[PDB]
Amino acid sequence: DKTFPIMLNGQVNGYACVVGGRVFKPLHVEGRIDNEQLAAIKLKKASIYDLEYGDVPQCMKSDTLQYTSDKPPGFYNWHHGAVQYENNRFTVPRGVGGKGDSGRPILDNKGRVVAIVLGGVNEGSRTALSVVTWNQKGVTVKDTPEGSEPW
Amino acid sequence: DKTFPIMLNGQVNGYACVVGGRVFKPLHVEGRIDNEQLAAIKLKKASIYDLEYGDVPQCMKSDTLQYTSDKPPGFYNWHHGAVQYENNRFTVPRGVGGKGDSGRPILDNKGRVVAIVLGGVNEGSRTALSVVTWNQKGVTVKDTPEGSEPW
Amino acid sequence: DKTFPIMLNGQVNGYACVVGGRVFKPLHVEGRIDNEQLAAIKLKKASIYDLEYGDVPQCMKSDTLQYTSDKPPGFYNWHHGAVQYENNRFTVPRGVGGKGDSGRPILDNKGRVVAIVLGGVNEGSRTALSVVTWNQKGVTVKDTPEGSEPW
Amino acid sequence: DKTFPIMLNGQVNGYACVVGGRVFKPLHVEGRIDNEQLAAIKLKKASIYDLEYGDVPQCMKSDTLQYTSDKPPGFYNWHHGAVQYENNRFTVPRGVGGKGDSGRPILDNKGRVVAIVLGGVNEGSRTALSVVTWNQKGVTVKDTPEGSEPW
Amino acid sequence: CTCVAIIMVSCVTSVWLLCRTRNLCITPYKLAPNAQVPILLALLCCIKPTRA
């Protein structure tokens, strides 16, 4: 996958994901993307649904495909491990869930992105992730568990 | 060699070549030279000779030297092949000469630059080159075939 | 040691060493630090010692300890030689000490920073070099010999 | 040695060490003691010196002998490592410096307590400890670094 | 003069209420171009036509 991070004062505090046609970036992080082609894009602020602008030209579109409907609750891919929940997100162990790990996509077994993490630092022995997804008909929803600090 | 390209919106659309003392950049392309040393130099306008100020620092001067008159027909090397003519350049076969090839110097067998390619994308059976040339006694001229679209 | 050098128009013009408590940068030389973490340090002017304010965060501070006063007249390891004196400075072999390479710390056999060079380009067959030093009880005193020249 | 964790709601949140003549307990933590014979100890608040009342009887007196001034900067028997400085605490690496382990003593090579830790969660690359020391003749000193969160 | 200020204030308030509805008409559907759009939410309440 291709996921350009976000630089601020030398450290990495967020990640920017690219889906087919559009470029994603979390609102909670501040900084400049390392891709100079992506810096000229006029990203616009929006509501909690995290709408940005895919103003990239034709030569590199459709990097990955967003996952469609008919979601099973089985195995799913993740950068730091695996998640196995559809209605919620899985209770992943420690290590993942620190700081500056926002914007990392959650992929399927065919390489299709299903969700993008935004929060849920630590909730005890079981950590829940606050992600965005599509509920039933492709309409973008935002699911947030209780006590989900911005992560 | 020493030829730093010009990038606009993160994409290479032109090449800037340095000759003895002065840097030459085509003004029908837009962007910024990626060298931080080169970007501090002012730019002054001219005709389609495509002149830029030669305010280079002392540590880098006399990189490539130009070629005077008494130019043979000969065989001259080229970055994507070879060109063998004197009055104009060789009409290279198709496929060579895409987009973003402007400002490429044409060198001799001793490394002496004799031309800078500007236009002539398609010229029928084979594509002729619209270059700038030093004439029979050391004055720079500009040779253009008819119906030569700029790069 | 980890001493970031100054940059001016590509080539080097001096070395800005980092000592615990206050980073040291000569204001006699010019340029900007290419490191992003040290670019956020506020440039505050100082006295004739050519000193920059040490606004470094405390975690990466005191990695390089500094030697105190009452130094022996024994061996001291210069970066390109060796100095053996206490009050004045011992002779260095000729050739070293050109232009735009000052600010290199003079260390001891224990690795502690003893002195910070500022001058001493060429002073005859016996090479004496103008330096800052700690005189008897920790007072930071600059000592310049007769006929000194900035470096 | 002999140290007592503080019982608060089932989890450990602080360590109450005992010195010969007077017991100790961190003021910024709370809970119940883990000894039946320490339940009669009169709890009181005090200044920033972390002063408690060691009214334990003679049956368990003289557990850990205190250390005088003129502490050498050599090795010290920290419970999770070592400390090799006198005026400041040694830069302990990452991992150590979690949460809920205040009041842990620092031992000498002769089995003598020299210090009691209070805080310093995390400072960044290194870690500084807000610890108590004795300055010159046995006068109790509380020493803190800049930006030390209690720990 | 007091009358024409009331009409001017109330016009730019309702049209910014309608523009906020316009921005939220399309935002749940721009993030998924693959999702189908209903014909009720395209022309009557919102403005956008069928594209791509």
Short mmCIF file of C-alpha atoms in Angstrom, two decimals, chain B residues 81-147:
data_model
loop_
_atom_site.label_atom_id
_atom_site.label_comp_id
_atom_site.label_asym_id
_atom_site.label_seq_id
_atom_site.Cartn_x
_atom_site.Cartn_y
_atom_site.Cartn_z
CA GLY B 81 20.17 8.61 -29.15
CA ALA B 82 22.31 10.51 -31.66
CA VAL B 83 21.98 13.41 -34.09
CA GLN B 84 24.10 13.75 -37.27
CA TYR B 85 23.64 17.07 -39.11
CA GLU B 86 25.03 20.61 -39.18
CA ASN B 87 22.49 23.05 -40.67
CA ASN B 88 19.69 21.61 -38.53
CA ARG B 89 19.54 18.64 -36.20
CA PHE B 90 18.89 15.09 -37.36
CA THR B 91 15.22 14.27 -37.82
CA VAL B 92 15.12 11.49 -35.21
CA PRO B 93 12.60 8.62 -35.61
CA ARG B 94 9.25 8.60 -33.85
CA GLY B 95 8.85 7.72 -30.18
CA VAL B 96 11.90 9.80 -29.31
CA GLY B 97 10.92 13.35 -28.40
CA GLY B 98 7.95 13.10 -26.05
CA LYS B 99 6.96 15.82 -23.59
CA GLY B 100 9.32 17.36 -21.06
CA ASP B 101 12.42 17.13 -23.29
CA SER B 102 12.93 20.90 -23.66
CA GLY B 103 16.24 22.45 -22.67
CA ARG B 104 18.30 19.30 -23.22
CA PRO B 105 21.78 20.22 -24.51
CA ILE B 106 23.16 18.50 -27.61
CA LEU B 107 26.84 17.74 -27.05
CA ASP B 108 29.85 17.00 -29.23
CA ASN B 109 32.29 14.10 -28.87
CA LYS B 110 34.43 16.31 -26.59
CA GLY B 111 31.48 17.36 -24.41
CA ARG B 112 31.01 20.72 -26.14
CA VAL B 113 27.36 21.82 -26.28
CA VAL B 114 26.29 22.92 -29.77
CA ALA B 115 22.50 23.22 -29.37
CA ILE B 116 19.62 23.39 -26.90
CA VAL B 117 16.39 21.65 -27.94
CA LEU B 118 13.24 23.78 -27.66
CA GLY B 119 10.52 22.66 -30.09
CA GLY B 120 9.58 20.37 -32.96
CA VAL B 121 7.53 17.59 -31.37
CA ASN B 122 6.24 16.08 -34.63
CA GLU B 123 7.47 16.77 -38.17
CA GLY B 124 5.80 14.14 -40.34
CA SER B 125 7.85 11.00 -41.03
CA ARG B 126 10.61 11.99 -38.58
CA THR B 127 10.67 14.75 -35.98
CA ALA B 128 13.02 17.66 -36.63
CA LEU B 129 14.43 19.70 -33.75
CA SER B 130 13.87 23.43 -33.19
CA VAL B 131 17.10 24.42 -31.44
CA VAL B 132 19.16 27.54 -30.78
CA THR B 133 22.46 27.63 -32.64
CA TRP B 134 25.64 29.71 -32.81
CA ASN B 135 26.06 30.88 -36.40
CA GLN B 136 29.02 30.97 -38.81
CA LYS B 137 30.71 33.70 -36.69
CA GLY B 138 29.79 33.29 -32.99
CA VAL B 139 26.33 34.93 -32.87
CA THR B 140 23.42 32.98 -31.39
CA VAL B 141 20.49 32.41 -33.75
CA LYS B 142 17.32 30.30 -33.57
CA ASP B 143 16.37 27.69 -36.18
CA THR B 144 12.75 26.58 -36.51
CA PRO B 145 11.14 24.20 -39.00
CA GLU B 146 7.66 25.13 -40.17
CA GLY B 147 4.79 23.68 -38.16
#
